[model samples]
Target: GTVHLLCLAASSGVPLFCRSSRGGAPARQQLPFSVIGSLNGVHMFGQNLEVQLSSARTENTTVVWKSFHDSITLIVLSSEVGISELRLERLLQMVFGAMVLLVGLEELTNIRNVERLKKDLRASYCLIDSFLGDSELIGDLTQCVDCVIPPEGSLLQEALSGFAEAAGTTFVSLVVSGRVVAATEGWWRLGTPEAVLLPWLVGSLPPQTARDYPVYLPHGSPTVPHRLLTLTLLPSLELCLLCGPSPPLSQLYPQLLERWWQPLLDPLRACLPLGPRALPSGFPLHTDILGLLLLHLELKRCLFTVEPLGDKEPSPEQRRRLLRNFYTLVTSTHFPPRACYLVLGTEEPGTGVRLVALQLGLRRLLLLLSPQSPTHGLRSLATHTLHALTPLL
Candidate 1:
């Protein structure tokens, strides 16, 4: 359970920061300067020889190296058993994304002063650490925004549109916990990483009723800052607005909350109980299903569930790991993105997990089923489930 993340100036090989966690508690000390430099040195050595070092593995650890624009180098060392290279690569991408989100790409890529850059990188430690820590959601690996399909999908969508129209912003979303419930077209149009990161940014901050944060869109506006305004409708349910410098948060808080969201309190409250399923109750799915991850490929949004049909035999952790490992196994080797469907079943009874991946138009569903599920029927089941979820998607 030891994981170390090192960030350095790629050209200079100067350590920007090091974050490490061993079994949940933060390591007593930052990685030694020698270790950080040596890790970067090996990669730099490759570059000097007209090659790039991407990854390496040992008997017990997996190491991944990702250099951004030849300016920043991020190296991660993970010792967790059964960890996949895909997971480590995504972790580096997300860690760099956190850097971009907080410190902007210009400052990160162009080094003015190494000391100033190191201090500036501190702002992202909280966001970056969330990536390193154990997670209940898998947006980092999937690269899709985790979402919830609430009962008031259409109603909430309308209210959100009107709220954004009145607020003079096109990007708005309804987030519960860290998962999106409904977002405007402009919000969905955001670069997929931002779509995934913004919700995470909100979720990571301490509980607050409102906030006006300055954000730089990594893909859309890397140099320019846009104001992100958030208002809490319920505990973890938030209404977010992305706008220009006008329409201050103080001007819109209480008034806008009353005008648009007050009458819809009942429907808004109904969204909270969707719980771990991330879908409204009464949606149909096969009984053998233990967990599912449904991705809207075009929209870059997803509905993920680790509890289907309310079964509790397999702990949520096991189900999550099963789905995550299965997803990694399928995407990395067997199934190409364009493939229509695939199924795999483990014969052993103890962990007899069946995995099914079915493509429906631009959407894909990954299901974890019990051993008893028939392999031949997974396609039809995924099709039916996707059809039932069409309106919400």
Candidate 2:
């Protein structure tokens, strides 16, 4: 019902962008802003509200609020039954976090225009769609972010040479199949749309580089434009570059695909058709697993789903619910890294599908499910699984 009825009324005119975990109609008219204004007024009294609202409530719908440091006020409305106080807070973070990722923090915080926020919100509708309404219900439960003990081998060398190869590229990122090849740290400096939208644009481009696309620097002025040049070096590799209005970098050796992408080819090919890595068999996770999922939080990839020995795996819709539930549980309870349980519904009329999850690691989450009582197996299985994944981890 939240997905269908939730409406985020804008502070002005009409609700240009209202949505749910699924979808909702835009508000036909602007909200009276009375309740919202009252809430805003309450939050203004830092000391008073701090002491009173510290504890969470079932009806705390003011999930989004003003950034004390910024001019924009973010607000969201969702159903209360399944959502929780902490989950809502984390959900709000994820929402705005994504916005920060899209547009750099500077422009996002310093914005003076409502239209600026509205228009950008519309552009990221699909991207935001993946996180909200009902899609990213799992993450509302848990999270964290960034990288490397993989060593400075050819992976790192080629990544360095990749920037050298494209002499003019200020910000560039490479993706091999689904694995990231190389990226400039400055790439994050670019707004979120370039990171998300550019890849989509690059992937869709034919073997032509006819036009240099115009992009906005979210960190700088949103109106000023930057030129984006993409090189389709190989069928499997692409070099995306961003620079100023100067001449396009021509020294970009197109042949580097043979040199740069060759090294990553085998690894990418090895991982080709790369399905989810099922847990080891000898541990006896088979019967206990109604479903087992391994999620890499920072990596927006799949939550890695696997069915146990004898049950039907969850379908698309079922996966969403589990994802949402897992997140709801974490946010509601606010556990830093504790073992938790989930009832995945069930096969037997009165029986509930049993589940448990561990922080596994800083950002890694491991979830396992079974038929009720045998959960005793999970104690040892978790130890064994955690130990097994530890060495490799």
Candidate 3:
């Protein structure tokens, strides 16, 4: 008797197997080869390949692909194999087919489990406004609220006090009509100049002409008061409080109203309607409103440079330089300047309510900027733009 061996080959993307016959004697005919493929209840075999073999002693063999999910099996026997052997071979084939079916089912189950987890997360976020309403879950919701007014009452009074203190009690009182509207009181009482003289000194005439007009008798008590400085409005027509001590009315008045002031006013102009009008139809006023506030704060810092509350005292030259710097910044095309007052109104109860609304709006915009935010593409673009500029500032 001659022994025969069965061979099997299996791969994730392909499968192959062979059954061989035993008994090599010339008179003894060899067992025919067979091939079968099956999974679950479905079974198939190559044409002329026996699904059932008999009258031969059969041995089964199997091959498994280690890295991927696949396997193959073969049966070896002689043409004279016994029926019992054939039956046993068929039984093992059914068991192996069932194992392959289970592998595919397990893969599908794992995929379904992953899909379930994703659905759960999505549902939770949608129910919670995409997690935006969760205050505890968010980051950096606090903001710094700085006071616009100085410690010494109004900003004007503070300005005068600051100047007086810095100038060493020289006591420069700004007299609108020789009446001393603002003065240090007691350090030095300069005699009041006549009120009638104020107009003569501040009128359209140049300071040199007004001061040299000889309106006052030589050696007689001088009658004309020093001219008053006129303030130029920013592009927004709002006064620039940071402009230095009003220059003599003659030379300073016209300069104060220079065209350059408008650059600072434009952004404010775009924002002012929010105060009286409902924001542009459908546009979220709240978020844009907060953006407007930030724009204002930045403008104040750029234009005034007067540390709204610090003890630092700047020289007159420094103040003028600061104003010029603001002018330059506003005029630049690349880094255009924005208005500041647009961010706020008179600090009354109404303004406070507006501020509260604006704050909420800003927070919403920031939520959109969050990394996982599902905000619409356009809204995200706007928030991202604001986010990019915020850090540079």
On TM-score, the stronger of 2 and 3 is 2
Name the best candidate (by lDDT): 1
Write the number of the candidate with greater TM-score, choosing between 1 and 2.
Answer: 1
Better of 1 and 3 by lDDT: 1
Ranking by lDDT: 1, 2, 3
Assess every candidate by TM-score: 0.90, 0.60, 0.18
Top model number, TM-score? 1
Task: Compose the digit string of candidate 2's lDDT tens values, residues 1-393.
Answer: 343111232233223355445232322333355754554444444434453322223363435443423333445555445665565555555555445444545455555556666676665555444445433123233432111112233464355456643556556665432223445656644443335444543443344443365555544744455666666544544556666666455645556434555566554343323222233233344455544444444343223334434344454455446655665565445343456665555566325556666665544445645454365566566656555544322
Candidate 1 TM-score, true structure as reference = 0.90
lDDT of 1 by residue, 197-252 (tens): 88888877666777876777787688777767788868888878877666666646
lDDT of 3 by residue, 1-393 (tens): 332223233222122222222332222232343322332111123212534222232253322111112233333332332213322333233222222221222321223343333332222222112111111110011111111211112333334444443333333333221111223332123221212122212222222311222122111222222222323222111221111232333333435334323333433343323221212223332232222212223221110112121222233233223332232332232232112111122444232111111111222111111122222343444445445434322
Candidate 3 local accuracy as lDDT?
0.25
